[PDB]
Amino acid sequence: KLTLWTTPDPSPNCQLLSDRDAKFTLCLTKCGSQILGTVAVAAVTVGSALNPINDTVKSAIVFLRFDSDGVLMSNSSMVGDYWNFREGQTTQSVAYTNAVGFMPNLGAYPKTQSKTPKNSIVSQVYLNGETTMPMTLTITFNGTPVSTYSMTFTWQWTGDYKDKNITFATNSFTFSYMAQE
Amino acid sequence: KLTLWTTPDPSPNCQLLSDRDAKFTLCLTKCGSQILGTVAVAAVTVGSALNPINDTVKSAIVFLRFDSDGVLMSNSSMVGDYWNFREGQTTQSVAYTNAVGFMPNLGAYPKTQSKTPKNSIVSQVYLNGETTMPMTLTITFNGTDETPVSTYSMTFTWQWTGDYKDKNITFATNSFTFSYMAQE
Amino acid sequence: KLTLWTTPDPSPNCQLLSDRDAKFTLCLTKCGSQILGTVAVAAVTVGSALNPINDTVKSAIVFLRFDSDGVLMSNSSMVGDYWNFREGQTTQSVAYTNAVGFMPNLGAYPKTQSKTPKNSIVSQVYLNGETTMPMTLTITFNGTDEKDTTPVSTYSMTFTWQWTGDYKDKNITFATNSFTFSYMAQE
Ligand SMILES: [Ca+2]
């Protein structure tokens, strides 16, 4: 259908540092030629370098790699079990076979070895919504086996938070991009 | 309809510090699973610590509380007179009975949890569009821990640290774009 | 939901300082009462003051002027040949005659001589996606034209990038990250 999502309230479904150590929420809503996205992430397994932040790790990356049918590939940060077209508050029960309608346009965002600013959205965001804890979010489109499409979410910060008992978690963030078809 | 708004050019319709001391513009456009929003606010007419800014008050808050039908509740910052589905440049003449399609998803943004970071959007914006006057906007979904109790809520909090009393600046914002997952 | 765009991968189609010195990408998607936009720009002609940046110019402005039918007018930064409704990866072959559905609402964003913050979206962005090169983007709806221009625009959309950094000792091409925004449509 016109929504491809994690469900609105996913179980731990993402690796930042180790298996299913995070809840990654992503809703892609197809508005014809453009996808409207909202994304959030939270570390949930206690004792990782990001839960609480101990300052040994100052980035968190979620890599989504997609084959030529827009199907999530195994070498992605996120598990594909509940990455699917919407049905009510959950996902359709059968894995989708084609989501090229949700893939980032390869004309707008080409696969290249050159750093191309147009491939990315780069914004200042705030760790746990705290304006004293600035962070950068880079969303990059199409940045073995080789992926045909990709969507990468990179959070980076320079602050030291060790012994503030801060869990890595983000505010919801809105973005858009041109769809492949 | 698929648009729930204040009209594009509202009359003073909002309390920041006192009754109808502000024009709050909000357009919610239903794109299936997601609402696309654009918001702006200006202190107007009524003299106050925000008109002009005298540096005693360095936040402005608009609280929208909704019942289980997504109907605006009386204990909101904004008056409901011209909060309705679109008709041309104005609102339909009959008060809406259901806008649950526009309410923030209680799964995505669970209730009372203003402190769960996923419930909010937090962004750097600019007081009066002046890039020397940085400000934060926090949009919080379903944050409120209140009678009568709201089922859904949307809170807009502007905050800044600068001192502007000498500049005779009235509190006003740029238009700001956001989105959130809809309840249905 | 209808799309008015530059195509996703435009040829040089834009003046920042001189004719076709830039690639301006703009995709406007009509979501009923609101338009959803994504914009990017890159200077492409080598030897311009923005390619590489020589610090004589620390703003880049794209002015789009539209008549009462929402048709792009001659004195715009962008060429209109491939500004049109989407067909596949390109534009429909016939020039559109009406896009008022895509124009910024004159009630929300009036034409006035008074500076009105609500007419604009202002955000911090980063030159070439580099966080050490902070930049502002101002998107203004229905800003006033040059006083000596005729015919006058009914609608307008201005994109202003500004920065304070000096980059002449580097070899920086002016180019932006993709940027998402929305606005209330006229109809
Ligand atoms: Ca002139």
Numbering used by the authors:
A (entry chain B): 186 to 328, 335 to 372
B (entry chain C): 186 to 331, 335 to 372
C (entry chain A): 186 to 372
Reported in the publication:
Adenovirus fiber knob is responsible for the primary virus-cell interaction during infection. To investigate primary ChAdOx1 receptors, we solved the structure of the ChAdOx1 fiber knob receptor. Diffraction data were scaled and merged at 1.59-Å resolution. Superpositioning of the previously reported structure of HAdV-C5 fiber knob and our structure of the ChAdOx1 fiber knob protein show that fold homology is high, despite only 64.86% amino acid sequence homology, including in the loops, with a root mean square deviation of 1.4 Å. There is much lower homology between ChAdOx1 and HAdV-B35 fiber knob. The core fold is similar, but the loops are divergent. ChAdOx1 and HAdV-C5 were both predicted to form numerous polar contacts with CAR, with HAdV-B35 forming very few. HAdV-C5 remains the strongest known CAR-binding adenovirus with an equilibrium binding constant (KD) of 0.06 nM, with ChAdOx1 binding at 7.16 nM, not as strong as HAdV-C5 due to a slower on rate (Ka). To validate these predicted CAR interactions, we performed SPR of ChAdOx1, HAdV-C5, and HAdV-B35 fiber knob proteins binding CAR or CD46. This confirmed that HAdV-C5 and ChAdOx1 fiber knobs bind strongly to CAR but not CD46. A similar analysis in CHO-BC1 cells, expressing CD46-BC1 isoform but no other known primary adenovirus receptors, determined that HAdV-B35, had a strong CD46 interaction, while HAdV-C5and ChAdOx1 fiber knobs did not have a measurable ability to prevent anti-CD46 antibody binding. These experiments, summarized in Fig. 3D, are robust evidence that ChAdOx1 uses CAR as a primary receptor, not CD46 or DSG2.
The ChAdOx1 viral vector, adapted from chimpanzee adenovirus Y25 (ChAd-Y25), is the basis for the ChAdOx1 nCoV-19 vaccine (AZD1222/Vaxzevria). We have determined the structure of the ChAdOx1 viral vector and used it in state-of-the-art computational simulations to demonstrate an electrostatic interaction mechanism with PF4, which was confirmed experimentally by surface plasmon resonance. Here, we characterized the capsid structure of ChAdOx1 and the primary receptor binding fiber knob protein. We have characterized its primary cell attachment protein, the fiber knob, and show that ChAdOx1, a simian adenovirus, shares considerable structural homology with human adenoviruses.
